[PDB]
Amino acid sequence: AESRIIHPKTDDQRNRLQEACKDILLFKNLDPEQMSQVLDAMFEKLVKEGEHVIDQGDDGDNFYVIDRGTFDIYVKCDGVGRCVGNYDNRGSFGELALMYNTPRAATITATSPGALWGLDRVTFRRIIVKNNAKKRKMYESFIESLPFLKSLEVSERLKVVDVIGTKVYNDGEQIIAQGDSADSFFIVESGEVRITMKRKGKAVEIARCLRGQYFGELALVTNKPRAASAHAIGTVKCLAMDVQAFERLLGPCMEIMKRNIATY
Numbered sequence: 001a002e003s004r005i006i007h008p009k010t011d012d013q014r015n016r017l018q019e020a021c022k023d024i025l026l027f028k029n030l031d032p033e034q035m036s037q038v039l040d041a042m043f044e045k046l047v048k049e050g051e052h053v054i055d056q057g058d059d060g061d062n063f064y065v066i067d068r069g070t071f072d073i074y075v076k077c078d079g080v081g082r083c084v085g086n087y088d089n090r091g092s093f094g095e096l097a098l099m100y101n102t103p104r105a106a107t108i109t110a111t112s113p114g115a116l117w118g119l120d121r122v123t124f125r126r127i128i129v130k131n132n133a134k135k136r137k138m139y140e141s142f143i144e145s146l147p148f149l150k151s152l153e154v155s156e157r158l159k160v161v162d163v164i165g166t167k168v169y170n171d172g173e174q175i176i177a178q179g180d181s182a183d184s185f186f187i188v189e190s191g192e193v194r195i196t197m198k199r200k201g202k203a204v205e206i207a208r209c210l211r212g213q214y215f216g217e218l219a220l221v222t223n224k225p226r227a228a229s230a231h232a233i234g235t236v237k238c239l240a241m242d243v244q245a246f247e248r249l250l251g252p253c254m255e256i257m258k259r260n261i262a263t264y
């Protein structure tokens with residue numbers, strides 16, 4: 001079809017568009033064809049400190065990917081809204097409205113001047129939601145066999161795959177580095193992950209994660225930095241998700257985790 005949306009861009013815009021998108025979990029499973037359709041529909045939108053890019057309750061129009069600038073996340077608790085987190089010069093938001101045809105479930109506002117790459121909902125539903133149909137096949141059984149995910153309404157566990165993204169790693173490849181700031185949760189799908197620990201300089205092995213085992217969740221809960229490095233042992237495939245997604249769907253897991261986290 002030629003009813004596709006296309007926003008002509010300069011070589012520079014595409015370059016930046018490219019950097020901004022390299023790590024967006026929602027694009028991880030798209031073939032080159034699907035990705036280029038997406039990129040063509042991306043439009044640039046500048047923002048200013050204080051600007052309410054999204055207001056809770058509003059209608060879902062676009063999906064956003066951050067090019068730069070800081071942001072704050074706000075939710076209303078009984079009528080009072082609080083900063084429940086934030087984004088820092090990278091990440092994506094505004095997908096829930098388009099995926100589930102529901103009102104914006106939060107408020108996003110620039111906490112400094114920024115820029116964004118938006119994606120209309122027609123394109124988003126046409127390609128990303130289609131993409132989720134594929135991901136569900138591939139990982140529905142698997143995800144539904146992960147013990148730590150028993151504590152979730154049958155319905156909640158369904159929306160999990162909708163926001164995970166597949167990351168491939170070669171042998172010897174670093175997945176996360178101890179110390180670094182954390183913005184993602186991992187779940188080994190295939191291969192093996194070696195977890196090691198070091199000391200203040202420039203390495204003791206402390207665990208091995210196999211298909212079905214998660215890691216990188218400690219720093220998300222303790223709101224602390226990476227407490228250990230992770231490396232791929234041979235080809236590894238992890239099903240990942242950002243913290244916002246983590247806290248949004250995994251709250252019902254923090255217990256069985258916080259407890260089993262004592263085993264650290």
Ligand SMILES: CCCN(CCC)c1ncnc2c1ncn2[C@@H]1O[C@@H]2COP(=O)(O)O[C@H]2[C@H]1O
Nearest residue numbers: 084085093094095096097104105106244247248
């Ligand atoms: C820190 C996680 C906070 N939680 C969970 C609390 C209920 C969130 N709960 C719901 N939506 C969130 C959350 N965080 C970011 N968004 C993003 O803010 C967006 C607002 O538009 P949306 O509902 O279409 O999609 C949303 C998400 O990408």
Ligand SMILES: CCCN(CCC)c1ncnc2c1ncn2[C@@H]1O[C@@H]2COP(=O)(O)O[C@H]2[C@H]1O
Nearest residue numbers: 195206207215216217218219226227228263264
């Ligand atoms: C049973 C070994 C327990 N220990 C060693 C005790 C000091 C651990 N101590 C600290 N982190 C561990 C440990 N095991 C796995 N991780 C995982 O390795 C991850 C490193 O990133 P993270 O800190 O965000 O979350 C971590 C855990 O999922």
